[PDB]
Amino acid sequence: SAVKAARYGKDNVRVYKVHKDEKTGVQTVYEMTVCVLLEGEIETSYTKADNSVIVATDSIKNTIYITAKQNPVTPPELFGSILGTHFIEKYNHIHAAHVNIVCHRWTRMDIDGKPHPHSFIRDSEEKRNVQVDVVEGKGIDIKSSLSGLTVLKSTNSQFWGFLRDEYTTLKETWDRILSTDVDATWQWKNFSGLQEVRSHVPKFDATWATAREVTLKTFAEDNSASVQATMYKMAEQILARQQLIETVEYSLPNKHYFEIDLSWHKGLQNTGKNAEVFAPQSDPNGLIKCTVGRS
Amino acid sequence: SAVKAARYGKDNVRVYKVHKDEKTGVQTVYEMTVCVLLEGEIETSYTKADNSVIVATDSIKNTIYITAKQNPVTPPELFGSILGTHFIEKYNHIHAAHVNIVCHRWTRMDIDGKPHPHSFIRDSEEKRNVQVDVVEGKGIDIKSSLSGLTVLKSTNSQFWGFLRDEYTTLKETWDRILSTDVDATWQWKNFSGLQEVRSHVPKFDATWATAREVTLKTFAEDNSASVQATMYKMAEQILARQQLIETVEYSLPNKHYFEIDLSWHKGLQNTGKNAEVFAPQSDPNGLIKCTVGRS
Amino acid sequence: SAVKAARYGKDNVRVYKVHKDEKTGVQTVYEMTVCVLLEGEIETSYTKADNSVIVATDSIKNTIYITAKQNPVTPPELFGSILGTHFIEKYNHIHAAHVNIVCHRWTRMDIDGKPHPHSFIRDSEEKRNVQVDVVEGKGIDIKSSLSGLTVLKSTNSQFWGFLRDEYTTLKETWDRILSTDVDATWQWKNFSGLQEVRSHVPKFDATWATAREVTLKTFAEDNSASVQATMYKMAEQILARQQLIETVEYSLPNKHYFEIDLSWHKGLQNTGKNAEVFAPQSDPNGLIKCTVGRS
Amino acid sequence: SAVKAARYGKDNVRVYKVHKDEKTGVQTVYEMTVCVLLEGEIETSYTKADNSVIVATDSIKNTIYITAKQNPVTPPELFGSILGTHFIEKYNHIHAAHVNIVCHRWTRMDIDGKPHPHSFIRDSEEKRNVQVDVVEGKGIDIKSSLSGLTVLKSTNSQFWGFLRDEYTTLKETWDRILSTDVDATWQWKNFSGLQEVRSHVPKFDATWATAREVTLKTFAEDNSASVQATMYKMAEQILARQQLIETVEYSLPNKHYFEIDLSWHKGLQNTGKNAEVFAPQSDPNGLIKCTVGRS
């Protein structure tokens, strides 16, 4: 046999960091979950019980904490790039570092209409994520995303004109509920190394803000022909707004809300124009995916 | 043997309702998960295979949908009271209905600074709940709550002066992180029936808003001596603000954030005044509970 | 205001223990999750920032580990009794200790038909639990349970003869699927203290084994008239087999499996006697509860 | 912009099927969760609101049920191949079908030492899965796996000889706990179509049984130098036992169990040879991955 691929490291590393402005008293918090997996000249750890090539996962954990103490943890694209660059530079035999970061929301509280200096709320389970692949001699590949952004519109969604054959029961509709959990990813141009990442730092927060704003506005305003058509509009607008993005990917469940025919009970009218009460369906769910790039 | 207690019904009934103002075009959505369990002269269904006393759980489900079509679903205290009253009035042999409702957030989106007429975001996993126990001849007992309200403050929490003996390792602290998931319950005066509930309807939304506001402000502003001391302040203020509440209950995890001593690595200082990077602990967690009533 | 009830402590304490027979080489493992909440003369911690009455939750955690090192962790009824007795004896002002234990399965592997001395499998997510309430001057109240025991029978379940009115759509059936997650609790006679618990130690494992055996056999063999009727048979048999049990409680979801009418497609027959393919329903679910005691 | 990749379909389709031997009375059950995502000449559904190219996800759901009624659902590799072949054959413009199946355990109960004809237990949360990619003109690519197989050994695991530098705190050990959740995947030789899959049908159940047996025996018997070394032994043995497998992949968390130093309390000895009570760590966790192929 032989090792065809191998990577290893530490997953599920929870990290908090606080910044304290000792002049204003304003504190700012950051919380993430980090995974770092390494690749390199490590096959003998698998084939010959050769632990000498292993940077222990415990040491990778220590390194995450140390790196967070010594550097900014925001934007996550930068932190992940710093962290991944450390492992390929420090260890000659390590040739790739794959850094995944999930950023958790801690939004400053407003108390009596004033932002509080040191109190925060988890205002959504929505995450901001990065995948940063630092590959020796091949630069830094970053995928940024938002996920867990759960939305619903109560009208201005349609679905008609689809293929109809002997497997089809679905009725056409000109007015339905549309709800999803948005998972949106933007793939950056390859960066040559950490200097190039640092040169673009403001673009990371700005492009996440653009992606989120476009997602929400297009969802709210598009009189949707399908999930497919609406998500494509989101992607095209994000590409138009940031030239350093190569592709935008969406992965969207269609979280169905079924009408409930109540006409069997006292002639109650609860379908079509009279539909008020619906049954949210936990499963199954449509799942619609697109990757959009330039033409 | 004999049946000492019995209740049965339908759990996990997902319900959506929309309101459409056909004059303004503004739509408003409501989503909940409902459980209804009944009690009464039902023991023979258990002891003698006598299904004649069973209102089928499927029929209880149907009834939840029908009741949502025929009545307001807000405030949940009212909906639950309507629903529970239906079962004890409709069925002579049913003597109690226990209605639990979890309300899911669908907050109207603001698009370009204007509230959108029909688009919503799940802006938090925080729930608003009710437990409505409708007991024939004994009125309606309501417990209202908020849950899943996750908060953190980065300073202005202390914990010193606790008992120290041979089981104690914990260091006293005058400056720590405090984070919790708030579960706060207010117990209403017994209501004699549905008329009395309806007579107090505006108090339900107002008291939930008070409970939430007091929770957030007291958490943010109290230089906390302990979870115990802070939560008591919340409860006392809520009781002072609504005379129709008899008790307030809090159940709070202390979601610990541990300092990380990095002095083994290059003398890095990350404890005490220099603490910036922390390890959030998933488990174990302190769990602190109080029920507060009038003196 | 005043404190009407209060309890506090440490939840979600994960504990492993190994026993090593250094003569045979056979190792045996135990894994649990423990919660200990204390009550007593603690109100001033809530009302006056008086931490002197607080046995820190961190110290409660330490105590759980220490107690596991110094005593058997099995049966859980005994461990919980030891642990709870410690807090009310050690601390004059602590008057109750509420100990919850969830026991996780680690079943010894059989390798080439021989039990392995030190390798284990999590052979089910089924738990064995205890709730041990140690109350100074009032002894030790134990509730034992099994939970998460998920079963299905493909026939020999019926449901007919239930109440039919204008809310009813459910068809009677003489042959359906029945599936549930068993939560079964047996409540012991009050014990006067730890000596009395210890005097009954073999009964704990024997009664858990009886409860499990009766559950499985009655589920498998009863041509069920309803969940209600079948669960009552389980409870009555357990009471008949252990006189030191006062009550048995079951809480059972009816995890519905719906027929799928396929007659719209090529006349396919998939209902009634021809039903082969079903749609498991995630929600809603019936929920049926009984507490059975002696007559 | 332009569509670079697109796939869509129905996820989370729960399916049960029963087989009834009407001669012996023995019933056998199967339960799965299915996802089917299609690719093909579908870009205009995204770019031009052209729903004519969409086989509705609802219709894909119907098709899963119909296919389960008309064909065996076991082995899952065969069912998935049938299902995926249907979509690329039925629809000229659909060129790939990606079928994921998770198989849930329903193990026949033994009652009084005899297998019961129609009662089953979910004896583990362990899954058997397939990923079947049916690509028009490119055959059928199958990845089979087992997942959620949770194991622990209490000794005969070591970890020493790893890289030690200024980031390292981990102590070498010659005797530790090892616990993981096994995710093991075997990748089949490409099949030309459904006939070739059918020609190998017995190999699917046999190779899953081999993979599971080798996993358990190697875990139990290897005096492990590392997760890396042990998992490689598993993979090499599986490749040696089935020539129609090209690669074996393992993904293994190292679910850490930490010693607890209790020497601060009464000199209690709970480390090294005296270690009995451990703290299972929920997070972080090592994560170790290998893909092994022939040399």
Ligand SMILES: O=c1[nH]c(=O)c2nn[nH]c2[nH]1
């Ligand atoms: O927007 C939708 N897209 C689809 O592909 C689909 N299929 N059924 N319903 C659907 N809704």
Ligand SMILES: O=c1[nH]c(=O)c2nn[nH]c2[nH]1
């Ligand atoms: O606020 C707190 N309350 C307690 O009871 C406690 N125990 N350890 N830490 C604690 N923090």
Ligand SMILES: O=c1[nH]c(=O)c2nn[nH]c2[nH]1
């Ligand atoms: O066993 C059952 N019990 C019930 O109470 C019920 N109601 N609907 N179906 C049911 N099945």
Ligand SMILES: O=c1[nH]c(=O)c2nn[nH]c2[nH]1
């Ligand atoms: O088996 C192990 N492999 C590793 O790579 C490792 N790192 N820390 N501990 C470890 N244990």
Ligand SMILES: [Kr]
């Ligand atoms: Kr962080």
Ligand SMILES: [Kr]
């Ligand atoms: Kr969308």
Ligand SMILES: [Kr]
């Ligand atoms: Kr609702």
Ligand SMILES: [Kr]
């Ligand atoms: Kr608090």
Ligand SMILES: [Kr]
């Ligand atoms: Kr244990």
Ligand SMILES: [Kr]
């Ligand atoms: Kr049952």
Ligand SMILES: [Kr]
């Ligand atoms: Kr199935």
Ligand SMILES: [Kr]
């Ligand atoms: Kr392993």
Ligand code: NA
């Ligand atoms: Na390198």
Ligand code: NA
């Ligand atoms: Na009644």
Ligand code: NA
């Ligand atoms: Na005491």
Ligand code: NA
């Ligand atoms: Na085709």
